[PDB]
Design a protein around this ligand. Sequence first.
Ligand SMILES: CCC(CC)CN(C[C@@H](O)[C@H](Cc1ccccc1)NC(=O)O[C@H]1CO[C@H]2OCC[C@H]21)S(=O)(=O)c1ccc([C@H](O)CO)cc1
Lengths: 99, 99
Amino acid sequence: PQITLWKRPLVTIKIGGQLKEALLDTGADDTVLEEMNLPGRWKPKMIGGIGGFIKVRQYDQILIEICGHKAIGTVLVGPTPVNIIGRNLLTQIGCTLNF
Amino acid sequence: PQITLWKRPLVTIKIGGQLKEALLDTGADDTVLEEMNLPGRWKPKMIGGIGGFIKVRQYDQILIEICGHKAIGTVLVGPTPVNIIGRNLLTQIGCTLNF
Ligand SMILES: CCC(CC)CN(C[C@@H](O)[C@H](Cc1ccccc1)NC(=O)O[C@H]1CO[C@H]2OCC[C@H]21)S(=O)(=O)c1ccc([C@H](O)CO)cc1
């Protein structure tokens, strides 16, 4: 589909057997999701934006479904105010900017 | 143009007569640029990111050219980690997400 940007580009995603709302964010290299208790091993990481840094947990090879498009990649879990779908997964679903 | 997301969507912008590089950021409501000198008056404003809130200078009705497309809107100036073009201007240049 085509998503205009009058409002936030929020879409439903499926991760860890759960449905969630997340931004399609071309400004994020990686995917950052709100706190959730995923199984498996992880690595600590700190990520910075406006206001400073937050501590997150890096999970690798996580399966996410975005608007029925399947993708698998790194997911960072931490106290983010919004679920953020970054470029590492946007490319996998064939997402582009156009103007 | 059509922009793939295997690299950061960085573009050249023209603001206040000066060229700069900025990131097309669909996850940003607003446009925020690093500290710079801009003509005209401004108002103190607050904006929040992934790591908290910062103080910015709000310039309204500013001429800004993005990858050859002209826009006139609000530009926030403050300690953002990188220059970001937000939806308030992406809409003006007719930018959409497509997959
Ligand atoms: C300048 C920050 C960007 C460029 C460095 C990167 N950011 C993504 C932007 O899209 C954020 C997304 C966001 C939306 C709402 C609340 C919190 C975050 N938008 C945003 O700050 O917009 C400003 C302005 O407009 C206003 O509307 C929204 C809030 C206000 S990030 O989240 O901080 C992030 C950092 C590092 C990674 C690495 O890849 C991981 O390793 C991945 C993501």
